[PDB]
mmCIF file of C-alpha atoms in Angstrom:
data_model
loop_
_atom_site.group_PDB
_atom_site.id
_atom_site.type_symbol
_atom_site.label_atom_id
_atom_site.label_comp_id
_atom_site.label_asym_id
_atom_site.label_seq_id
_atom_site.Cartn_x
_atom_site.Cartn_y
_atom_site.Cartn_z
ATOM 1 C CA UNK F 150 -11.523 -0.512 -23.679
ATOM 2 C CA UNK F 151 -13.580 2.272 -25.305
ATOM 3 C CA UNK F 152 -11.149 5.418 -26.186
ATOM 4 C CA UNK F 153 -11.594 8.840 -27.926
ATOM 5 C CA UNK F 154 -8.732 11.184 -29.103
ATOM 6 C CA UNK F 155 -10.579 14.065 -27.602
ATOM 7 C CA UNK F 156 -7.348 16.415 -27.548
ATOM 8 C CA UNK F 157 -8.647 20.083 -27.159
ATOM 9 C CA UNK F 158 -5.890 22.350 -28.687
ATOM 10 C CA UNK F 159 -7.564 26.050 -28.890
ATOM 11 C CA UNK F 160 -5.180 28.632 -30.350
ATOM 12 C CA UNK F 161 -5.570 32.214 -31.381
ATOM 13 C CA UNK F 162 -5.579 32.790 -34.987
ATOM 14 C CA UNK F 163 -3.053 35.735 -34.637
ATOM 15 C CA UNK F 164 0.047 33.319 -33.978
ATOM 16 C CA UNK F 165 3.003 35.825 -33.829
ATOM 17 C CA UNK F 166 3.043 37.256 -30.379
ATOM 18 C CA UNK F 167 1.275 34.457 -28.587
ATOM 19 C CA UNK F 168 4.755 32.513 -28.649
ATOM 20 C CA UNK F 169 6.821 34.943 -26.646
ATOM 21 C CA UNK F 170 5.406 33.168 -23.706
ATOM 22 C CA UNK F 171 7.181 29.987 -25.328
ATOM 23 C CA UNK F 172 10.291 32.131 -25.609
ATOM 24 C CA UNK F 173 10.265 32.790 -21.709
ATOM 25 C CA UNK F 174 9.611 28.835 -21.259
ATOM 26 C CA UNK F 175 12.720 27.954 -23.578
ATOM 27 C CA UNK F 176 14.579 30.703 -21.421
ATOM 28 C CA UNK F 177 14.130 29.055 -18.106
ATOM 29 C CA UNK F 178 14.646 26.024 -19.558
ATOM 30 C CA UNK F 179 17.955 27.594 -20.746
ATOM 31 C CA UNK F 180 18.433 28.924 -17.163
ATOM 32 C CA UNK F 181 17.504 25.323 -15.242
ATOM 33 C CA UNK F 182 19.808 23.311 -17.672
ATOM 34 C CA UNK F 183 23.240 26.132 -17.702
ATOM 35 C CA UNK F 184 22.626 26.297 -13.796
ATOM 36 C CA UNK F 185 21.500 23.172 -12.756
ATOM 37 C CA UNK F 186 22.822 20.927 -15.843
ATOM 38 C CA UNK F 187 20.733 17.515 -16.139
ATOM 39 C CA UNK F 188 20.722 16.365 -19.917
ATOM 40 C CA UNK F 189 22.905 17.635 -22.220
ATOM 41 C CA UNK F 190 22.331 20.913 -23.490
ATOM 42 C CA UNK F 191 23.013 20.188 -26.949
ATOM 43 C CA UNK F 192 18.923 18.983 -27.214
ATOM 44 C CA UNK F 193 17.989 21.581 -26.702
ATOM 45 C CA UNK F 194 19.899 23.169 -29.832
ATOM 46 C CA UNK F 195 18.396 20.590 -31.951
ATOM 47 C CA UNK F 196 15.020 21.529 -31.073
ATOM 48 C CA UNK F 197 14.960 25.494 -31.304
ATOM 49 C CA UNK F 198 11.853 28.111 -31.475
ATOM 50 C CA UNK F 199 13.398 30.021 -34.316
ATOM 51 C CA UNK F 200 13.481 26.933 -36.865
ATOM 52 C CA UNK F 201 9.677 26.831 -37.475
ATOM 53 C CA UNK F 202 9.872 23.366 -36.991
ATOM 54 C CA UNK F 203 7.274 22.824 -34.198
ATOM 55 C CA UNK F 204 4.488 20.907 -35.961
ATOM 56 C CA UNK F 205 2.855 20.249 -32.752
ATOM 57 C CA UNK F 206 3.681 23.572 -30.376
ATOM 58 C CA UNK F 207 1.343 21.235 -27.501
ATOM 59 C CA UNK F 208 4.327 18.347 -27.562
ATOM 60 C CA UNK F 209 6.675 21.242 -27.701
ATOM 61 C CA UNK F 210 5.686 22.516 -24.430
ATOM 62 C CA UNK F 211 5.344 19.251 -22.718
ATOM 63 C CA UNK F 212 8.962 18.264 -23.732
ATOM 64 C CA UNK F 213 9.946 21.612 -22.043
ATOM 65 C CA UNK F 214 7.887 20.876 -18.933
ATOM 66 C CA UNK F 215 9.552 17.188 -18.744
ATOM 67 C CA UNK F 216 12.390 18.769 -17.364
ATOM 68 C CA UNK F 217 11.049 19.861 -14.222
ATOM 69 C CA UNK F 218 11.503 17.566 -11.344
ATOM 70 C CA UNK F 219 8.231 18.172 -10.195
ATOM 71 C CA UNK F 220 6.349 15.195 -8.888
ATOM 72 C CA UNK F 221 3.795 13.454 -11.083
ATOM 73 C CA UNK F 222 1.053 14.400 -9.940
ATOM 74 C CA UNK F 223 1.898 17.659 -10.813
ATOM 75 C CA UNK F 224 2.109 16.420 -14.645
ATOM 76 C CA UNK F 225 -1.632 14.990 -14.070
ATOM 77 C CA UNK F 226 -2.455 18.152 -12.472
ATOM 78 C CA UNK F 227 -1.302 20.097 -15.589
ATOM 79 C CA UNK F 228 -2.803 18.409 -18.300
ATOM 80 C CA UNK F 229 -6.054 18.927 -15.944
ATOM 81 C CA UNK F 230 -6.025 22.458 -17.017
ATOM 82 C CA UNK F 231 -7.272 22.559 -20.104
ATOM 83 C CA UNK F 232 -6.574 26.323 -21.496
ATOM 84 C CA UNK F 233 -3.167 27.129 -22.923
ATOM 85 C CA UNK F 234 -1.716 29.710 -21.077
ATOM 86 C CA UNK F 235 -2.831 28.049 -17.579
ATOM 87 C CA UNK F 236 -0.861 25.161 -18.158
ATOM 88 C CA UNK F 237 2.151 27.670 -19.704
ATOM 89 C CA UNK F 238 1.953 29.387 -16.139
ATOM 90 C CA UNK F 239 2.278 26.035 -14.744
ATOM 91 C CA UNK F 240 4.785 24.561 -16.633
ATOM 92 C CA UNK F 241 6.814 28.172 -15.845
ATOM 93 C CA UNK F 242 5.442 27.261 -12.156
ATOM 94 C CA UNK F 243 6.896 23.992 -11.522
ATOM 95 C CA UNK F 244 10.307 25.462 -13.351
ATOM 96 C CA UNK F 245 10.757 28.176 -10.923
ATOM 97 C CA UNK F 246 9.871 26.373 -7.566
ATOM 98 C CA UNK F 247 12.933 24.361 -8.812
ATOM 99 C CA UNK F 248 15.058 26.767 -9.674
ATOM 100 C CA UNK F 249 14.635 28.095 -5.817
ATOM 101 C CA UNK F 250 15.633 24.744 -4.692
ATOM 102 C CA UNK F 251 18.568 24.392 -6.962
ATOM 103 C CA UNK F 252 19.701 27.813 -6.450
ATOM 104 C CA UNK F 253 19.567 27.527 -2.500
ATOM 105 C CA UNK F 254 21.741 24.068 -3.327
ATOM 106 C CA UNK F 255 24.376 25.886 -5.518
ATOM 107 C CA UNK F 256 24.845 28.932 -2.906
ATOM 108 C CA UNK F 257 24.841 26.506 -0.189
ATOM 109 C CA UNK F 258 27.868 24.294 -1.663
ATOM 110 C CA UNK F 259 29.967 27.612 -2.837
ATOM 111 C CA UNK F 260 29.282 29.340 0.776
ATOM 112 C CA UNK F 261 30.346 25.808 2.901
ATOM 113 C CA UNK F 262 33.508 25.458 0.190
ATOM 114 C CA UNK F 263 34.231 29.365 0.622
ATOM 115 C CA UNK F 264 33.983 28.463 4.523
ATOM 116 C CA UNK F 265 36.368 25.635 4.273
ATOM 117 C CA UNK F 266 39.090 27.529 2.324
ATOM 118 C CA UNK F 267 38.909 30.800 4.552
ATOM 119 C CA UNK F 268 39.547 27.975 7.062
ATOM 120 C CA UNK F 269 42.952 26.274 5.689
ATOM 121 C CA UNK F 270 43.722 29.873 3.916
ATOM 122 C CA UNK F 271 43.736 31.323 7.750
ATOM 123 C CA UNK F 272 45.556 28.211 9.260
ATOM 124 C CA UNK F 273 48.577 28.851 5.905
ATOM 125 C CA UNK F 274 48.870 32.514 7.759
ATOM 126 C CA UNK F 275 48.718 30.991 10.703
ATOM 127 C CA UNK F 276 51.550 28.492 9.914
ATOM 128 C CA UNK F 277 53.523 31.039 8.285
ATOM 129 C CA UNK F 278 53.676 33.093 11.425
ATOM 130 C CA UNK F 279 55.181 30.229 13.176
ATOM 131 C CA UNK F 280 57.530 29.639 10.714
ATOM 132 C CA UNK F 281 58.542 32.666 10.386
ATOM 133 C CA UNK F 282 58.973 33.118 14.209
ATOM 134 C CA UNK F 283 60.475 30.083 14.680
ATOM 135 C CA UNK F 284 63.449 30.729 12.810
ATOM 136 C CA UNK F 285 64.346 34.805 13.763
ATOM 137 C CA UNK F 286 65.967 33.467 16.998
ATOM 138 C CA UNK F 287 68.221 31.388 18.600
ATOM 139 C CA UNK F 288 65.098 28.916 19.895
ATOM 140 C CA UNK F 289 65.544 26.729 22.894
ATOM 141 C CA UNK F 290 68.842 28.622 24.195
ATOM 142 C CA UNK F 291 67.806 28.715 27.996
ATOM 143 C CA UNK F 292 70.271 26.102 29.158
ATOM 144 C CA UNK D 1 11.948 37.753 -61.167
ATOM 145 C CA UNK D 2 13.162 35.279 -58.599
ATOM 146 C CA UNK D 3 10.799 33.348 -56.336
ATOM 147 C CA UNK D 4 9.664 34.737 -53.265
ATOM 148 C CA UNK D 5 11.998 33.176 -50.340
ATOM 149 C CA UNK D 6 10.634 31.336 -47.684
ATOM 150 C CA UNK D 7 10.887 32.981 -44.384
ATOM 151 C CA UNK D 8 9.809 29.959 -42.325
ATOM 152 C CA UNK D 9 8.678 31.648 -39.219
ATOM 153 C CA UNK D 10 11.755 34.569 -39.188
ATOM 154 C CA UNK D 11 10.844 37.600 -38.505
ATOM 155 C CA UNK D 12 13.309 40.450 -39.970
ATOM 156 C CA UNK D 13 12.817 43.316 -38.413
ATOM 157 C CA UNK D 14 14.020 46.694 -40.643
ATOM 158 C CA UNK D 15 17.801 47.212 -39.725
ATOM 159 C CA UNK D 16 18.129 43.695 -37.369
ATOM 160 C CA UNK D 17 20.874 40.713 -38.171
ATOM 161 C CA UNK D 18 18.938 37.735 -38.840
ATOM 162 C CA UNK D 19 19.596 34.242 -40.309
ATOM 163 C CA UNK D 20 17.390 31.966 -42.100
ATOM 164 C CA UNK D 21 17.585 28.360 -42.334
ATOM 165 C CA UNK D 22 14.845 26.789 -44.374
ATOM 166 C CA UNK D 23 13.695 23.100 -44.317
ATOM 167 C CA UNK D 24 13.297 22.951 -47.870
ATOM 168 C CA UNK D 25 16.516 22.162 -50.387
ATOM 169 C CA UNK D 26 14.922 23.859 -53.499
ATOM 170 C CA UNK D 27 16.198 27.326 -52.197
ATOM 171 C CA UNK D 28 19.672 26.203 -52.319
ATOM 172 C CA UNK D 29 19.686 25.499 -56.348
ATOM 173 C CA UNK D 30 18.681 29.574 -56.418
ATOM 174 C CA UNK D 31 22.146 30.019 -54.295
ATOM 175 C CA UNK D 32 24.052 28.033 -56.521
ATOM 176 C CA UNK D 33 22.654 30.132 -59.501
ATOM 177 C CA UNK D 34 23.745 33.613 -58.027
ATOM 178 C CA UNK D 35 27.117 32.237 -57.126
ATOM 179 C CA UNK D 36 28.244 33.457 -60.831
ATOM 180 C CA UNK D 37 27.203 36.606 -60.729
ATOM 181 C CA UNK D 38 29.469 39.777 -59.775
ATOM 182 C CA UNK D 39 27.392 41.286 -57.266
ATOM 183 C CA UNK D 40 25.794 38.553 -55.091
ATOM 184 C CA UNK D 41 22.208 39.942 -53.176
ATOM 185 C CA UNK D 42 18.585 38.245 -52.092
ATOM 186 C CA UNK D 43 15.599 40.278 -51.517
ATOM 187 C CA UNK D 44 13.683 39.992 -48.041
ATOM 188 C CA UNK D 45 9.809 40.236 -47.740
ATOM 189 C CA UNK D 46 7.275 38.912 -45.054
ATOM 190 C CA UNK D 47 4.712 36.264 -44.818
ATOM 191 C CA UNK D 48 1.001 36.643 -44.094
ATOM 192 C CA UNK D 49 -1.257 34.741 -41.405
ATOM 193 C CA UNK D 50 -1.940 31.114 -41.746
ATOM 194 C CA UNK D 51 1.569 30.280 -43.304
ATOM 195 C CA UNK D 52 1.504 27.196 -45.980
ATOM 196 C CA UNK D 53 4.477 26.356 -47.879
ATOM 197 C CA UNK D 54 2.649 25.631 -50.809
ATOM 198 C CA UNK D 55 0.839 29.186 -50.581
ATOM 199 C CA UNK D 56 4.583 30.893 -51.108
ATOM 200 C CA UNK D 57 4.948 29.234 -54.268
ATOM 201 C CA UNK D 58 1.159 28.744 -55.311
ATOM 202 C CA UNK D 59 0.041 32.954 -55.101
ATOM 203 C CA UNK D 60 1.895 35.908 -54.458
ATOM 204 C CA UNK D 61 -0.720 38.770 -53.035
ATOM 205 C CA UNK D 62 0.113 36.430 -49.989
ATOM 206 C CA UNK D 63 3.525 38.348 -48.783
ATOM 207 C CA UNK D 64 2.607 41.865 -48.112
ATOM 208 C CA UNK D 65 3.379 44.663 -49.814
ATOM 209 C CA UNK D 66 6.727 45.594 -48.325
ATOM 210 C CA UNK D 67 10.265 43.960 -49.125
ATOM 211 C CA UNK D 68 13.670 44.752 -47.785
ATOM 212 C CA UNK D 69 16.336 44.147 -50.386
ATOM 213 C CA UNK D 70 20.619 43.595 -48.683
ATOM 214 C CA UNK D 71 23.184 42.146 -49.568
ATOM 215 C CA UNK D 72 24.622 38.753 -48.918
ATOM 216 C CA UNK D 73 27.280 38.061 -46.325
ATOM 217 C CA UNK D 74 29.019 34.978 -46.346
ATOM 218 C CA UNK D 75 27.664 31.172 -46.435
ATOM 219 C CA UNK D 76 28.248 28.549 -43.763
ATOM 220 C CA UNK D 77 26.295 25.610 -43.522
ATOM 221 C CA UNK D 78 27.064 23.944 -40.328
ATOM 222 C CA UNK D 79 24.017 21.501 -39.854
ATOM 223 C CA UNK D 80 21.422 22.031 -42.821
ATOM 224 C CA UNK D 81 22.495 23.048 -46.341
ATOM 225 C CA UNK D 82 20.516 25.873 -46.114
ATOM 226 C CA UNK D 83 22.261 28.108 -43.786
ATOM 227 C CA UNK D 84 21.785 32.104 -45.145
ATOM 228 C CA UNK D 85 22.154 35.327 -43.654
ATOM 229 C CA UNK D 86 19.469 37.782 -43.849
ATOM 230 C CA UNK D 87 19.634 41.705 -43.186
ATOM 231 C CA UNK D 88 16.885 44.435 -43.429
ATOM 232 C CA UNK D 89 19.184 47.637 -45.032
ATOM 233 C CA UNK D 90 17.085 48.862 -47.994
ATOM 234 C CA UNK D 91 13.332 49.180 -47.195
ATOM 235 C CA UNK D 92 11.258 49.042 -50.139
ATOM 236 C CA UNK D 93 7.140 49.537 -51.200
ATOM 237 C CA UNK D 94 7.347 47.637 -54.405
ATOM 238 C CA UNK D 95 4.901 49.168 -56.735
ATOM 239 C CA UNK D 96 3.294 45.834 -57.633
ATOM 240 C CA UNK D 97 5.504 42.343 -56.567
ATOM 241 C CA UNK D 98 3.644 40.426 -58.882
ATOM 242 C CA UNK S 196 26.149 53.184 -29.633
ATOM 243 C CA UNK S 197 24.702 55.949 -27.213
ATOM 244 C CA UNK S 198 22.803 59.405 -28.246
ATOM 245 C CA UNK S 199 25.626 61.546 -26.807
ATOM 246 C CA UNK S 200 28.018 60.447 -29.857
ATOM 247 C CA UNK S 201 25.830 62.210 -31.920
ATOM 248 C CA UNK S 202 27.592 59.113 -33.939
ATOM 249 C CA UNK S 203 24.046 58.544 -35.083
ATOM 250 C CA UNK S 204 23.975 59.988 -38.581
ATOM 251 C CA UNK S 205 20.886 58.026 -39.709
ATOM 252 C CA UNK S 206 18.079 58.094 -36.777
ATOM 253 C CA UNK S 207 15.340 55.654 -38.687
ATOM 254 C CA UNK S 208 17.876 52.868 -38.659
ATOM 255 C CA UNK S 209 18.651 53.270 -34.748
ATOM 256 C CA UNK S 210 14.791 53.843 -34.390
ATOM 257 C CA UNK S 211 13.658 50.634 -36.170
ATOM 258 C CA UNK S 212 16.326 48.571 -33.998
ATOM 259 C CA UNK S 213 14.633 50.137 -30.986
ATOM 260 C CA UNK S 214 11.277 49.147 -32.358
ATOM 261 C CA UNK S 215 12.375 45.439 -33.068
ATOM 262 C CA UNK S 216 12.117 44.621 -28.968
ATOM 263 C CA UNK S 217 8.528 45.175 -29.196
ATOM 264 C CA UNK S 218 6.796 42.435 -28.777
ATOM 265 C CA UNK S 219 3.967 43.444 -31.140
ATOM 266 C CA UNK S 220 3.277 40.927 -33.369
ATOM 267 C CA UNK S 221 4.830 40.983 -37.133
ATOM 268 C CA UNK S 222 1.562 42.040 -38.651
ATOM 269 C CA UNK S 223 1.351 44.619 -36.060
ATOM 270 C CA UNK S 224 4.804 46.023 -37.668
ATOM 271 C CA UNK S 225 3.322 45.973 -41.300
ATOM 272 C CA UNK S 226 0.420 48.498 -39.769
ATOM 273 C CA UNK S 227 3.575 50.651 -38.544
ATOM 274 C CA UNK S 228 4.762 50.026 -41.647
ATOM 275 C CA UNK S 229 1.863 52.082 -43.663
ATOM 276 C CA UNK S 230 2.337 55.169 -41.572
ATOM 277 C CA UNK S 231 3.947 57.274 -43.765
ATOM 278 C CA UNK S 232 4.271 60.192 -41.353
ATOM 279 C CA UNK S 233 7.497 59.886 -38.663
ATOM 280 C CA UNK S 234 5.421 61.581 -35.695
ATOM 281 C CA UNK S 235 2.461 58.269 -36.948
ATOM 282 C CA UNK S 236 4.723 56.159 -36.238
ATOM 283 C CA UNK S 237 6.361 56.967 -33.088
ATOM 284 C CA UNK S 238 2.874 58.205 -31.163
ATOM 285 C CA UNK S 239 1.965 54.139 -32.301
ATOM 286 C CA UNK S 240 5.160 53.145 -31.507
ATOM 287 C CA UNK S 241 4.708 54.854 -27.835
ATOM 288 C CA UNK S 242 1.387 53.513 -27.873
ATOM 289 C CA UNK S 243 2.842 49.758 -28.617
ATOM 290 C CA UNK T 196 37.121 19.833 -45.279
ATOM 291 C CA UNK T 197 34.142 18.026 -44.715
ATOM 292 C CA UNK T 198 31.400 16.785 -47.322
ATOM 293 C CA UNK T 199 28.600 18.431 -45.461
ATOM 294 C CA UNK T 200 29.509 21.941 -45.776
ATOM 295 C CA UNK T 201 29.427 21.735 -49.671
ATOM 296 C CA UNK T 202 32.582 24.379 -49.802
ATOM 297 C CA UNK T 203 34.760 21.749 -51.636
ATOM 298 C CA UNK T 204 34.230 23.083 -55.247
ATOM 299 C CA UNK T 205 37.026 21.363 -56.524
ATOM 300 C CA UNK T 206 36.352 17.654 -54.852
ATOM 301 C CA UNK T 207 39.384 16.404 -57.537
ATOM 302 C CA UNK T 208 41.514 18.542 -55.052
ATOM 303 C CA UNK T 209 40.443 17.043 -52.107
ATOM 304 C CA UNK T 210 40.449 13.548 -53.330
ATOM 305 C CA UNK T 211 44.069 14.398 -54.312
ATOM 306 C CA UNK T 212 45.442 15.496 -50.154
ATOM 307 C CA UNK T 213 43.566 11.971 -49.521
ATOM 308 C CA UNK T 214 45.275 10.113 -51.705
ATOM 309 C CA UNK T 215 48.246 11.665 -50.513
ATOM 310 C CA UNK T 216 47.746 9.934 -47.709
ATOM 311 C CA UNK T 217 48.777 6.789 -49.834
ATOM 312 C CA UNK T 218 52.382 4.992 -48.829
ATOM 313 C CA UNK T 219 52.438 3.664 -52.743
ATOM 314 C CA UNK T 220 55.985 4.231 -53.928
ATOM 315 C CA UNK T 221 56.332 7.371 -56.247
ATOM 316 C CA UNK T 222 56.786 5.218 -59.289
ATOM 317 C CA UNK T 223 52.628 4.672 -58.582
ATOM 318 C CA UNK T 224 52.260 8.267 -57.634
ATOM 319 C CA UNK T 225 53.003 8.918 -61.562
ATOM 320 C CA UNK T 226 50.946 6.269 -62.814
ATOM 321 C CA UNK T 227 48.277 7.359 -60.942
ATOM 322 C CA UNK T 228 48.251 10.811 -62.244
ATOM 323 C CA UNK T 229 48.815 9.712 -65.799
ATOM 324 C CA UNK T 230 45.610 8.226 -65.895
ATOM 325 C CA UNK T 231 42.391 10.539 -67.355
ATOM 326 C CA UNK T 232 39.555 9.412 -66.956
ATOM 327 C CA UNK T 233 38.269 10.026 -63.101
ATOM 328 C CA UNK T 234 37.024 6.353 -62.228
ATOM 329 C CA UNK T 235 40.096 5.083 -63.498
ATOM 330 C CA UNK T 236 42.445 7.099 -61.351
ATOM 331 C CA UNK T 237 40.372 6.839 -58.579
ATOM 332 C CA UNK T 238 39.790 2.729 -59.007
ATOM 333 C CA UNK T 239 43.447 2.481 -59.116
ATOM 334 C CA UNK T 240 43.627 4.738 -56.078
ATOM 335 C CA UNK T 241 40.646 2.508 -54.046
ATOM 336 C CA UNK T 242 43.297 -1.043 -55.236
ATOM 337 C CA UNK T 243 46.806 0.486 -54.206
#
């Protein structure tokens, strides 16, 4: 079947403030993986921003984006777009309408635990009180 | 007279901590020849658009005219075995770098 | 390190640290960088 | 001491605490440092 690497890759010649955009990427990234840990985190050590070594910034990006748990057709959808920052917004896009998700998830399972230990921590007073009331007195000296 | 250093996409901004950590192995043999010396100190300039790692060693109009000459701290090389510290302390308009 | 020390014997070095969380890029610093003039350098600083 | 950091500058030394290591009777401890030459000592050390 007939095939054509026709890979469109325009980038601004000045190259030194265009990656701060990257830098906000690799920071939600950062944020998604510390508060919502799914691979290890030491990856993304090996692969850093500040080492120069991104060759190929385009597979950079996509490696980022992989981490979202967006569905694929949101993948198709962003390599649709073919300008550079449009699919940056999108790959920051599909990060954040996680990160709502996995934040409502984490506050969710702290508040129910919280709820569960105010629970027992109330019923330990409660028990105390008896305790503590139960042997002042004499107890069960009507007869 | 030493070769210019390669910043490898590391900006050092005038009085900012900064580390560099080259691919290349050919800096090292320059640390190793400095080691001997009393005083121990590398020299800090920038690189120009379009960076080429045989441009830094081919021409040298390419850095620009300013350089920011510190002192070394200490040497660690945890991963790569080129693992120095950088510093901007001594700002400098070299009259010609050449 | 805060301005009401006065613990800030050397203002260009506090200045240039300030400067460094511009996100200008590097060339853009080397044009700073030519100003010899302080009052240059801080109106394109502001401006930045 | 690892051999990736490069900060041995005296690997003799370090070969030395591992060959310390060694459960060879003392009598081969002495024999061992007798020898000179440095693929001598450590062949001898690689066969004990």
């Amino acid at each position: 079947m007939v095939e054509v690497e026709n890979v469109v890759h325009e980038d601004f010649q000045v190259t030194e403030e265009v990656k701060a955009l990257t830098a906000e990427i690799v920071k939600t990234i950062r944020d998604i993986i510390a508060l919502n840990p799914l691979y290890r985190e030491s990856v993304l050590q090996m692969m850093q921003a500040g080492q120069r070594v991104v060759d190929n910034p385009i597979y950079l990006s996509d490696m980022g984006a992989a981490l979202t748990g967006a569905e694929s057709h949101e993948l198709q959808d962003v390599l649709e777009e073919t300008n550079i920052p449009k699919r940056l917004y999108k790959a920051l896009s599909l990060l954040k309408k996680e990160f709502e998700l996995s934040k409502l998830q984490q506050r969710l399972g702290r508040e129910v635990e919280e709820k569960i230990k105010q629970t027992h921590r109330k019923y330990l007073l409660q028990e105390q009180l008896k305790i503590i009331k139960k042997e002042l007195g004499l107890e069960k000296d009507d007869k | 007279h030493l070769p210019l250093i390669a910043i490898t996409r590391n900006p050092v901004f005038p009085r900012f901590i900064k580390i560099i950590e080259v691919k290349n192995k050919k800096l090292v043999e320059l640390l190793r020849r400095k080691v001997r010396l009393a005083q121990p100190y590398v020299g800090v300039f920038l690189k120009r658009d379009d960076s080429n790692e045989s441009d830094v060693v081919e021409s040298l109009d390419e850095i620009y005219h300013t350089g920011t000459f510190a002192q070394i701290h200490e040497m660690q090389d945890l991963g790569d075995k080129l693992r120095m510290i950088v510093m901007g302390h001594r700002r400098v308009h070299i009259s010609r770098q050449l």
